[PDB]
Amino acid sequence: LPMGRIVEIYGPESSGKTTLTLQVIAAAQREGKTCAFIDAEHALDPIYARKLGVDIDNLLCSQPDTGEQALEICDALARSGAVDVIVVDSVAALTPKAEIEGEIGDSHMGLAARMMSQAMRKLAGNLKQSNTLLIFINQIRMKIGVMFGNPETTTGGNALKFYASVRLDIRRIGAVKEGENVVGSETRVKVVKNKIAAPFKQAEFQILYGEGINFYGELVDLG
Amino acid sequence: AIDENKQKALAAALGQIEKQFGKGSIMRLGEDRSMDVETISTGSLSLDIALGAGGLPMGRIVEIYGPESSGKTTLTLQVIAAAQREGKTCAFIDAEHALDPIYARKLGVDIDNLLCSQPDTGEQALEICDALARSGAVDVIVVDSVAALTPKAEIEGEIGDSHMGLAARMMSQAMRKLAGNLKQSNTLLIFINQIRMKIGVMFGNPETTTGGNALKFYASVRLDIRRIGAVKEGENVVGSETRVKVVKNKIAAPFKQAEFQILYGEGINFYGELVDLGVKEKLIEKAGAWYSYKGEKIGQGKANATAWLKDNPETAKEIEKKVRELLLSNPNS
DNA sequence: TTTTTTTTTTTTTTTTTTTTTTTTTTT
DNA sequence: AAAAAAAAAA
């Protein structure tokens, strides 16, 4: 993954989005780099992060109240020049202040898409100067009034698709069994956008519950 | 020399963030105690083992779904009863308009202290959940059927009028607003969901759940409950044989399952589980259809062995203690 | 040869920004 | 296989 750029990772429920993103952090911390995790979903388990190989004691973590606060912390850490990797867990949970103060049922027409469009404009330049990698996790939603193409879409509007240097589609394609005991997931990643090399290549690997990505399993298949 | 200017730049940035947004706005993950996972009992010992962390996680969202008369409401009332016995406050949002308070009392719920609402719209139901979460004074909220959370525009409208993804949009907005508030208050939110069949499919599961896709993403636990048979007293059907599958888990390994009995008017059969678990850990010897503890022949047939454990509380406590110590991945005492 | 006096009055616009979400058997 | 309605900023 390229330093100083924006990356998007999206997929369905329990496809391994958070697990993949913690393995990037673990690998970067072993090379002396500093990392931050913005947990907008409010669902990070620190003991699981430790089992995957993250140094919990040095990882900066924030659970912000609004989307604006989340993206202002990203800008501040990027300008500092001292953080190498930032992860933002779900764009889908980046709630605008006006929507939090409001009531359930109130319409907020394209307010989240407008905030995201503003954030990309402000961040792209700062990330490139600091040489900081920013990873956005995104969730999938269905679009209505469609027969062509894919009815699948992502959250947060159109800006992120333009500014991302790499976009990754992750999917669970089966179970890893020890006879009866389900012990992990068979996983496929498609590269759907690439600006640093050719796109549309794919990768297959195993995620084992409590260990993470099965390295030696890949080394067999490649050997 | 160069890594020392970085430490200073980082310290300044952390200072500026904490000044702008408040004290605990950014910290190191290892020194954040609010981020530790705390669990409460489900009222079933086999399900507490299947979940891996010894129960359902406080501060998170949980989904329980299944077919008609599978025990969804009964399971949530057993969670509330177990929580009330630890001095926690509990609320029940009855969107189905089908709760019986006499039956709730028989399952062990304190009817006099349980908060209850029968809201008119889905928006009203989800605004009450948000208000109780912000209060900081409620520990467990149950919402009976997502399926019955009707948007205001659909109630004011006529039967036949199309409302394209209006319910799905309301749930997507509710998750965004609630997730953060539930974590700050340390409140557990349980959603009950119904199964619907999907058309235009040949592969996979044609079974779907109601209310759109948002809840699948934000839930920390998802439970599929199913009636697998009858519990008989010769002729009289006295209860249900029940299976729960953990189809999503973020606090331990998923895809474990639990089997137990629901007896009509009592609820979940605790001693019936404790027999089957004590047998599995070699603390109870099973000689064909005979149950024996430490050589002492206690009963023949599961029902008599359960009745024996009932009238001897101390030996039941001894077997519980052992099963708890052994099989739980994270014992908390 | 000798010696200054005193203010008056407004003028005129410029330019958009951004999506969100499924629903249900039928024989 | 056929569908709908939502605002606020220098």
Ligand SMILES: Nc1ncnc2c1ncn2[C@@H]1O[C@H](COP(=O)(O)OP(=O)(O)OP(O)(O)=S)[C@@H](O)[C@H]1O
């Ligand atoms: N603490 C844990 N212990 C054991 N297994 C886990 C844990 N957390 C996640 N997993 C499993 O790892 C697999 C991938 O999980 P994640 O990386 O959390 O996926 P995800 O796409 O981020 O899912 P979300 O955010 O919940 S929609 C799933 O099968 C999980 O059940």
Ligand SMILES: Nc1ncnc2c1ncn2[C@@H]1O[C@H](COP(=O)(O)OP(=O)(O)OP(O)(O)=S)[C@@H](O)[C@H]1O
């Ligand atoms: N008041 C009651 N007295 C005796 N048995 C009951 C009572 N209420 C429910 N039951 C039985 O307990 C079992 C589980 O019922 P529930 O817990 O209501 O299941 P459920 O999935 O909530 O079903 P729904 O909401 O009707 S689709 C069923 O066999 C019921 O008949």
Ligand SMILES: [Mg+2]
């Ligand atoms: Mg995740």
Ligand SMILES: [Mg+2]
């Ligand atoms: Mg019910």
